[PDB]
Design a binder for these strands. Sequence first.
RNA 1: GGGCAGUUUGACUGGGGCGGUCGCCUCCUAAAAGGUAACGGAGGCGCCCAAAGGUCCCCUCAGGCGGGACGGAAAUCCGCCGGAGAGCGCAAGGGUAGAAGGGGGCCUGACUGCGAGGCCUGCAAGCCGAGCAGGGGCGAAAGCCGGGCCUAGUGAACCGGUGGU
RNA 2: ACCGGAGCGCUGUCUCGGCGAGGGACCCGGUGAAAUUGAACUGGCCGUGAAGAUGCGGCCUACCCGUGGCAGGACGAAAAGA
RNA 3: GUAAGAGGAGGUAUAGGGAGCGACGCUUGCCCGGUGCCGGAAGGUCAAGGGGAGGGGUGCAAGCCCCGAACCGAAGCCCCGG
RNA 4: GGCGUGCCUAUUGAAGCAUGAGCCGGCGACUCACGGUCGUGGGCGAGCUUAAGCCGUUGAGGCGGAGGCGUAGGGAAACCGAG
RNA 5: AGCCAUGGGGGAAUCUGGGCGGACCACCGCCUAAGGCUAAGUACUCCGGGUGACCGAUAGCGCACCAGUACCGUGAGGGAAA
RNA 6: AACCUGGGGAACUGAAACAUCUCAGUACCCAGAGGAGAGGAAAGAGAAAUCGACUCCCUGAGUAGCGGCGAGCGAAAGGGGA
Lengths: 84, 64, 97, 50
Amino acid sequence: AHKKGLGSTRNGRDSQAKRLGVKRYEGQVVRAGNILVRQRGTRFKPGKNVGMGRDFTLFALVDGVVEFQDRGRLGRYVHVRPLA
Amino acid sequence: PKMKTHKGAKKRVKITASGKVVAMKTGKRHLNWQKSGKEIRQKGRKFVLAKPEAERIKLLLPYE
Amino acid sequence: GRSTTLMRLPKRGMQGQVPGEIKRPRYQGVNLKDLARFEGEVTPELLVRAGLLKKGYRLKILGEGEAKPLKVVAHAFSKSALEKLKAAGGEPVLLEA
Amino acid sequence: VRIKLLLECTECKRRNYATEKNKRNTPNKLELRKYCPWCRKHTVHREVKI
RNA sequence: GGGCAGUUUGACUGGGGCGGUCGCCUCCUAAAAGGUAACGGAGGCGCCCAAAGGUCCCCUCAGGCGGGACGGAAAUCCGCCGGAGAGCGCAAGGGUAGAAGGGGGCCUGACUGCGAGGCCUGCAAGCCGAGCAGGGGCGAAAGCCGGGCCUAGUGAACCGGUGGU
RNA sequence: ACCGGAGCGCUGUCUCGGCGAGGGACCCGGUGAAAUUGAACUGGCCGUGAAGAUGCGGCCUACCCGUGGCAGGACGAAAAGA
RNA sequence: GUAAGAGGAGGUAUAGGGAGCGACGCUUGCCCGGUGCCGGAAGGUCAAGGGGAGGGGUGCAAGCCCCGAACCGAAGCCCCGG
RNA sequence: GGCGUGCCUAUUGAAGCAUGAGCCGGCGACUCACGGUCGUGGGCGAGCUUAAGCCGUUGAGGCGGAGGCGUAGGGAAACCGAG
RNA sequence: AGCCAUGGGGGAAUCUGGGCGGACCACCGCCUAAGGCUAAGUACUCCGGGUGACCGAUAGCGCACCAGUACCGUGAGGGAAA
RNA sequence: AACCUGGGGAACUGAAACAUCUCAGUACCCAGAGGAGAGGAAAGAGAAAUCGACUCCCUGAGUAGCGGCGAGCGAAAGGGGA
């Protein structure tokens, strides 16, 4: 056979993929303390009874239903509006 | 004859008056300094399930 | 390999001395709704002959129940259950004279 | 790392506790920071022991 | 003190041994949810900041050409132009000048007792936080504060030290 | 009586084998085991097939059974592979 | 050999035991840095030990139990050289 | 003449040129004791039940409550107690 | 880390003597140590008597029977058939 | 034949490794006693001014403790009976 000098590597190292994404959308009731947007930078800016935390994560403050918004010269918006 | 209650287990777990096994929250000792009062007051009492089958089924004799 | 989820900490205070265990008087609780069943007197002697109690050193009254007047007999009694004894009942504390 | 080490402040007026960290390397002479104890409102607090 | 005893003497692995590796974070591969393997690619972490932390007063860059003692491709200042290529500790991703960046003032919420309800998931551990009440700091106020723009900086338990109840 | 190198004579070691020997082998009678053994009714080629077949496809040689003889194959027997 | 004792040996440093090479002829060179080994009446660290300054629990006390300093305690390893 | 890859174990997968067996007859392998534990068949029911032993029997049972389960939990603990 | 017991060492007292009640101290209890004897109630099956929801010549004891026999090995032991 | 008192006293195995522990103070060696053995009248127990030799059953009770707090090991008191 004869197997002379070969080698190794240094890249058998991966980052444990952490489940990230948006959980709740317009049409779903979210009631007080339900995460609904997982992200790193401001992919989704809070608003109407929406909340952010110590890691840019949107959640529910009210017992309201989600909905979205676009404001270019400001950012992307989520507004979780409830009922009158 | 006679099975034997699990000593350690007996002395380190809580089985609620309802066939539930619910113990204490682990992870409190060589930490505490660079942590929120959160991690302190929340590492108090615990819960658990699933393995409580093994816990209860091993509790036994005086049950406890 | 990992601890058989034995990673759960101990909390059993006073788990182990060496001269056996501390010899203390063991109290015994009882619902006085079970009391509302029978009528007459309830001595320690009688109430182990009946259904409950069984030599539980000392008896303490408790639980729900009704305002039936009689002779309850024991040692200690619940502050809350003594409010039931109020509506109609009698209290003998700590036996022997 | 110990250089930053770990130390704990305590209130004056008998005991009390709260957990912290230092930095001896950094101009850290002594500390007398202001916090709140279990008993009563915010008061003094002195640094002591490892 | 191998004179004799009884045991130890990792696993992975394109047969094994030798070289390489073990955990944690980023980026691909990864096929527009996640998630997704390889001894497949490309890099980073075992720390740092009592101010790089908290609030109020306040400023916006890197650069581009023109113009100038030393400077002179780049020390500085100026004029016009210049929406994120500047910086934001460290790797990169994501993100940001309608601030997270940089300047000052008072401070010390790296708060105490609790935690609604959700992320995540074999367990266990990890992730998020409203509100509540005690008091504290700044703010004219409206109001923010349970450390740091985030993802790395970590070790269940058994044992024991130390101060208290 | 240990491992090479050489040289002479000598010789079936070889060129290359031929006869001969008696004793076994083969036929007559007396006695008569073994390992192995799923059952067999067991030719070949050419493909296939878990990859090397009389048993499968396609397609095959040759009446039925024996005696002496050789040893390619039955992945041959003995070794639950050193 | 746990041991009594046993051999060594009723032998005595031209003798008894342990290791290397192996008649005989020539001959056997440098390195004490690591280590084994020889030796050395200063010393470094350490055992139980000796000792008792100092502390505590408790009884009214007399008292008893426990903790323990300074400093003196070997072999050894470091040490010094062969 | 139409058709037709033996039985088993192991296997991604075998008729196997993988393995086990010449053939026949018998021996031969998931129990038992105690405790737990889910159900299930009944009796009793806030009560349920006796072990040792003793008495009787010659396959005749019965007395025997010591004890265990149950009527209450929460708290490491003192304790509090439908909290 | 008591208490019981003891190998080396020191080393008491006689009823105010004295052990223990789990470091040790106070108290309060309990018992009389360092001499010895003691039936029954429990254990056991070489043996005999009785029972069976135990077996019926591979079962049953290894042995139904001329079995601890033949036969195997120095040997301790193995262990037939019938 | 078996049990029984002491004098000695392993390992496999468990802990999915292995020392502490387990197995086990079991197996085996020894001494010696007998129908029983051994034991046996309290320097006991244990908290109540409670009991009153020894052996035994059952309960207490996997209880209390023990422990690389793992394997696992695992008491007497009291009770009711002989």
